[PDB]
Amino acid sequence: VSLLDAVDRDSRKAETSAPERVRQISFPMMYFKEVESITPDEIQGVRQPGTAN
Amino acid sequence: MLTNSEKSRFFLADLTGEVQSIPNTYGYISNLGLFRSAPITQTTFLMDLTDWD
Incomplete structure (x- = not known):
């Protein structure tokens, strides 16, 4: 909006407001994946780090 | 107590x-x-170190 300007009542004029505007947008997205596995060979005969037997 | 003079x-x-x-x-x-x-019964001792990131 904006301020109006003066006008003479016997020299009549008129102001007008500009139209409203509309707009649109869009977005993509991100994808993440991870994988892991366990095998018996990782446990066979592996000593625990903090203990002797 | 008395002693010989100088x-x-x-x-x-x-x-x-x-x-x-x-x-x-x-x-x-x-x-x-x-x-x-930390008294011990041997002439040497060991330790284990574990790391990951």
Whole structure:
């Protein structure tokens, strides 16, 4: 909006407001994946780090 | 208690004792108690280190 300007009542004029505007947008997205596995060979005969037997 | 004089064996003088000088010792850290006592029965010991990121 904006301020109006003066006008003479016997020299009549008129102001007008500009139209409203509309707009649109869009977005993509991100994808993440991870994988892991366990095998018996990782446990066979592996000593625990903090203990002797 | 009486002892022989300075320049004659036939006269006595009085002895008043001794004064001792003892060297300084500091032992500041030893009293903080930072270091724990961990006696062991061997001439060597081992440790294990584990890391990941």
